[PDB]
Each structure stands twice: as structure tokens, then as C-alpha cells.
Symmetry: D2
Subunit: 236 residues, 4 copies
């Protein structure tokens, strides 16, 4: 079982980042062509602390991928029109077709994160959601979908630095939520305990160094895809 206490947030990567980044981004383009020809859809989930580096990691991963074959979804907490359905319906509507890629910047795991800590979901709802989500991902992965989920983590000091830099780049609740970091760590740990499956693994990425985090996201995506290619008897 994975827990945030096991991640070394001091891990760093130098300027060999340019080399590995180029190699891995072209490898990601190759993976896209493999997925398209074999009609296997790909689902990438990104969770983590605010400003942990989810957007930059996503962009580095899809930089060399053909945009005609992906959609990156920014997910917020359910709004009234979304609350007219079961909480997974919005995600079934956004599923990639076989062979396509869907990226979820935050995802259905909001059910056991912000909705749990803020009380949008009752104790019964979030407590049963682990098994419900395992079932959702299992129905998908028993067919022609691959699922992998990343949790990007940063220290409170690195997060504060990035908060300070973001308000100066003009391109609230977040400062309040920074105060609830221990609760989010506990909720994420329970999430790792109950939904880290061989068919849909969790990868914990220490994100203080953005370059290391981006390369790790790439490495884990490609390794998981490669394992699935081997398990299906296909050539990558």
C-alpha cells in the first residue's frame, strides 16, 4: 500500500531533462499511434495538491501527440445540472472512444477528496465510492481501455512559493484550502489504500522539481502502456 510518507519530496533532476524529455515525448507519439491502430483507449487521471504541477505535466506529456486524438478535461466539483445524475454519469459522457486519449485534470476521485473533506458527499457516499470507482475502472479495463492515475505532491513551502508567483502572473478559497492540507493527505492516503489496482495503478509523483515530475509522468505512462502491450500480445 502506497502512502505520501514514502515519497521523497527532495528528489530532483538536472538539465538532462531536455534529452529525456525529447526522447519520451516522441515515444508518447509512437504510443498514440499504437493505441489508435489497435483501438485501445487511454485514460489518464491527475490529482494532487493545488499548484502541484498537474497542468505542466499534462502539457509535457501530450506536447508531441496529435491533438486530433485527445481531449484534456478540466474537472470541477459537480454543479446543479450535473447533480441531476449519478456522480459518474458526467465521466461516462466524457469517455474516449476506443483508440482515443482522455486526460482528466481532477476526476471522479473528487468524490473521495474535495467532496469528502468539504461535505459535498455524505459519509456513506464517499465511504462506498472506493468500491464503486474500482468497479467503474474494472469494467473499462476488462475491455479495450488502459487507465493510469497520478497523484502530484508538493511541500507546503513549494506550494506557497507557487501561489505567490501565480498571483503576480494575472493569467480566495485556495488559500483557505491550503489550511486543510492534512485532511487532504489523509484522504489521498485512504484513496491509495483502496483504489491502487494492478489494472489501474496509482503513481505518486513528488513535484517540487517540475522537470523530474514531468519526466516521471512520461516514464510511468509509457511503462504502463508497454506492459499492457505485452499482456495483449501486441508489438510496441
Amino acid at each position: 500500500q502506497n502512502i505520501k510518507n514514502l515519497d521523497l519530496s527532495i528528489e530532483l533532476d538536472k538539465k538532462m531533462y531536455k534529452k529525456k524529455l525529447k526522447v519520451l515525448q516522441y515515444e508518447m507519439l509512437n504510443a498514440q499511434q499504437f493505441l489508435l491502430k489497435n483501438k485501445i483507449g487511454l485514460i489518464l487521471v491527475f490529482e494532487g495538491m493545488d499548484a502541484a504541477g498537474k497542468g505542466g505535466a499534462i502539457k509535457r506529456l501530450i506536447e508531441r501527440v496529435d491533438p486530433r486524438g485527445y481531449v484534456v478535461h478540466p474537472i470541477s466539483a459537480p454543479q446543479p445540472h450535473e447533480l441531476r445524475y449519478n456522480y459518474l454519469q458526467r465521466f461516462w459522457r466524457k469517455l474516449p472512444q476506443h483508440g482515443q486519449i482522455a486526460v482528466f485534470d481532477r476526476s471522479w476521485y473528487g468524490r473521495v477528496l474535495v467532496e469528502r473533506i468539504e461535505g459535498f458527499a455524505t459519509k456513506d457516499e464517499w465511504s462506498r465510492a472506493y468500491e464503486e470507482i474500482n468497479n467503474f475502472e474494472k469494467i473499462l479495463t476488462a475491455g479495450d481501455y488502459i487507465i493510469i492515475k497520478f497523484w502530484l505532491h508538493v511541500s507546503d513551502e513549494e506550494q506557497l512559493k507557487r501561489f505567490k508567483e501565480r498571483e503576480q502572473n494575472p493569467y480566495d478559497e485556495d488559500w483557505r484550502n491550503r489550511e486543510k492540507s492534512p485532511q487532504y493527505i489523509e484522504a489521498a492516503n485512504e484513496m491509495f489504500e483502496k483504489t491502487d489496482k494492478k489494472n489501474a495503478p496509482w503513481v505518486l509523483v513528488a513535484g517540487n522539481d517540475k522537470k523530474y515530475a514531468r519526466v516521471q509522468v512520461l516514464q510511468e505512462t509509457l511503462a504502463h502502456i508497454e506492459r499492457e502491450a505485452l499482456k495483449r500480445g501486441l508489438h510496441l
Copy 2:
């Protein structure tokens, strides 16, 4: 065993002239149930499967006759087409789910995965074999929230089914849309019975029950669909602390 099987269904049961009274009463009760579900924002999902010409359409129509049509959709489900095969086989049904408080009726449904798709080989052995648990999990996530689900299997004898095939080709309203495949599948009825019984064994749950309806007498079948729907709605409401 208390597993349901079609061989235990008494296809000789019938109903008389008390049909008009019971029918009008139960249809107005169904209107009442619709208003209750709307006020409490609980969606209702009714599944209809069975033999060809067993009476699904007539049962559905009698069930919704006094219900406000602004609050229901009846979906005629066929086998997955190429555009549907681009997704997991449950995606189309997640797209067709009612909003909380609305009613969705499925004339055939996701159980095609373990019925026609099994028998015709559209699904592989692994797919339909694992589909039972997948379907249980799907229905369980819905009913743990704000949906009520009940499923009906309408059955008729081979002789009654033949009589109804013949009556449909003589009806001007129906004779335009009757395929030879129904005549083809009459020969595969034993395989459908085995597949249906395994379905009943594995997916008849308290939160999503199967009701086996003897349909040779249409009046009996329609009254049973109404009664069982209303009784299940009341039981599930009670489990939520609500009273009709």
C-alpha cells in the same frame, strides 16, 4: 432452490372482468408514484426483456397510460451498431439514464450482453461471462444513490407466441415492421431460455429484482407489471424513510 427459473412459471394463469377496475386504479396509482418520485428526485428505471411477442410493448403502454409524458422516455434497444462499438457496452445506457425524478423505460436493455449477444456470438465467452458481475455493479451504483430499478421478463408459450406472430402480420399497423429474424429466433428459443435462467441466477438482486411474468394472458401480465412496479417503488421508498 429459490433461484427463479422460467420452468417454474405457470403459463396457464389468467385474469377475468376485474381487469378494467384494477387497471384504472393501478394506472392512477402509477401517476401518483410518478409525482412522488418527482417531488423526492428519485429516478425510476424499468427494464423489459423476454420472448418475441410476449407483450412488452402492451405492458409498457398500460403502465404509462396515465403518467405525464413530460416525465418519461421509452427506449427501444437493438444490438450495438458500429458507432456504439466505439465505447464500452454500458456507455450508451449511461447516456440514456433518467435524471433524478424522471422515468426511463428500456424495451430491451444492457442484458442483451448476456442474451442476444451471447447467443449470436456478438460477445465473446469472456465478455458475456463477466458481464453478469459488471451489470450487478452498474445497477448497484445507481440504486445506492437516487434510482430505483426493476426488471421484467415477459414469457409466453411457443403456441401463444406463434398465434401472436400470425396476428401481427394481419394487423395493418404492425404488418409493416415484422422481421424474419423473429421467425429465425423461434428455433433458438431453448438457448434463450438457458441464457435467461443463468441471467436470473446471477443478477436477481433485492436492490434490482427480476420479475418473471406469465404473458399468455395479456391482462394478467399488464396488471402484474403495474402491481410489481408499485410494490417495489413502495419498498424502496420505505428503505429511504419515505412513505407513499
Copy 3:
């Protein structure tokens, strides 16, 4: 070939209990029309607008009573909510369009853009004033293909409307629903008459006609909706080189 106006409608017209005979006959003709539309893969779009409690729901229910529900959807349309305001105001209706061969009924519809949205200010002056032509173009794109469209405005007198408001507050199934909007709209009825008349002047087209229904007598209104629907389907079939046959 004439401008319709609400002031030309005789709200005194009535129909006797000869309602049962014509009603059953017309409902079966509507089933036959459903079969014709499905066989020729022509979709049908029925719009209902009018005063609150003018009888839209009851008219819709009698129209589809003997129609197979696997081939229709009745949409209750309300004013756009935030999630709908993320798109052009017609996007939600394109998402609700019936497939070729199917029937879609709209209890209120896109004409809200020139009715409640105009009167309540949800739409700006420029928005509702340009909506007439926008809507004609929308309906023309649909009817030039394999769709038939017809639109009904149900009208009642203010006294009959008040009587029906009060009788619904005692309807065990109707009462529980909220009705504040209904009293708001009743207070603005003169403006609705003006707005609907401008609508009739600008969007009553041969490929998508407006039918003005005197609704004080519910039986008369139901028979008129059925008769006008079937007559329009017959004419449109003839224009397509097809024959609608009993």
C-alpha cells in the same frame, strides 16, 4: 397568406360530446401517421406555446394517446439555466432534435427567446429582435430536409385562466408543484399578447405554420390540435411525392 393575430380568435367556440367519436378516430389516425413517418424516415416536431393553463399538456396527451411511446419524446422546456447559457440558445434544441422517423414534442420551445425571455429581460433587445429570422432559418434548415414542423398557440380568456389556476390548486397531483411563475406571467399577459402577435407575424411560414387554438373548450382544442397535425402531415407528404393513407 394572412397575418394571424390573437384578437381574431373566437374564444366562444365549443364542441359537444361528439368529442368521443372524432377523438378516437383521430387518435388512431395519429398512430397511422406515426407508422407513415417511421416508414418514410421523416421526423416530426410539434411545438406548443400559449398562456399558462391554456391546455397544452392535455392537448399533447390526447395527441399521443394511441401512439407508440418508443417513437416519441415530450420535452418540458424552461428558461435557460447557467449550464445551457454556455452555448448558443438553440444548441439545447439541436441536442433534442428527433431522429428521422421519430417524434419530438416541445412543451414550450425556442420561441421562449421572443416570449418569456423578451418579456422578463433574459434576452437583450438585440437578441430577441434578431431571433425571429434566426428561428425561421433554423426551422427552414430542418424542413428542407426530412423533418415536418408545426407550432400551436393555445389561448384562453383571463377568466377561464383564473378558473383553471384555482382548480389546479385543488388538483391533488398538480397542487404540490410551484406556480409563482404562472402568476407572474398572468400579470404580464397584455405583453404576452403583443409578443405572440409579433411572433405570428414574423414566423408563420408554409413550411412551419402557426395554428391558433381557442382553448376555453378543452375538447374543441384537443380535436383541433389533432386535426391540424394530421392535415399538415398529409400536405407535406403530398409535397414529398408520398401518400398518407388510412
Copy 4:
């Protein structure tokens, strides 16, 4: 009126491409933030000859734009499930929300291009489609949408070269190459009838991919900025 016969396919751009490209891509990022802040959607249409460079131009335009705010749709001819509706229905389903970006690699103009030439659409259908499409774009642009359409054109020899380079890394592409004169006629008629001030056509000579990409960027940004001015808004920094 625009016609492909007036397009100079010899146009070129040299190594000043890298710097201009970087600047224009960052300007497109700024444009995305403006579009998002003001809740104005952007619709980019790409049509042209097979292998004219539409995909690469799209890729350079969105390279530095946040992918949480765009979708690029690869559009093919209507299939049976799409033929259950009016031909514009699929595209209304694909409209971006206010503030979002939607790119169409081929689009509703198939109605008057491939569908006209291959006979998927009858004479009546494709002949009335120009006005239908103008009305569609007009309802969108009178609200909170901006639309611009690009036609990418290449020479027959450059097209053959690119066909050979792709086959060394479908049949329909060779099918359309043989009917290229008819496609030129259809595109000219399209330009004549649907080049509107609110939804302009931009004809891009694509023999030099670098020039074509910079032109798509420049014309997109110029149209967005003009539209900002028309709405009383300032696209600056």
C-alpha cells in the same frame, strides 16, 4: 471574390520562421486567455487538398495553448448514425462552450465539397447548403462566437510528393487527387458564396509548410483582434 487561381503557390519563408513562430504562438496563448476571460468561443475551420498541411498548421497554432481549453475534431463523411439527423446536428453537438476553442479538420463544408463531388448529397441539398451554412455561422457569430475558415492549397507535384512520403512511413486520397479539378471548382463556388465579414475564408498556399503555419497564426490573431475591437474589447496584454 477569392479564387484558387489567384493564389501564388511559390510563396516561401526562410529561417526567420523560428522567431516569428514563437512570437505568434505566445500571442495565441494570450488570445486564449482573452477568449476565456470574456466568454467568447472560437471556431477554426480547416479545409483543403489532401496532404495540404492542415494537421501541421493546427499543431503549430495550438502548440502553446492550454489543452484544457480546446478540442480538435477530425471530421469524416457522415456515417449511418449521423445520417439519422440533419447534417448540421453533429456539429451543433461539437460546438465549443463560450470561452472555449474548437478546431475542425474538415467540417460542415463537406456538404458542398466531397459530398457534392461524390454524390453523397443531391443537387438540391448541396446547392442550398451555402445559404444554410451562412445562416448557421450567422446565428453563432451574432452571439458570443468567432469563426474563421482556412483553405490550404498545394500544387499537384507537391501533393504527389507528400503522398509518396506518407505511403513510405488510403485509396480515397488518390480518388480525390484524380478529381482535384472538380474540388477546385467546388471550393471556388464555396468562396464566392460563404466568404462573409463575420466568418471569412483565408486561402493559404501550402507548398512551403513554414509560411503556411505562420499565415494561419497571423490571420487567426488578426481576426480575433478585429472582433475584439468590434465588441468594444481590447486584445492587448
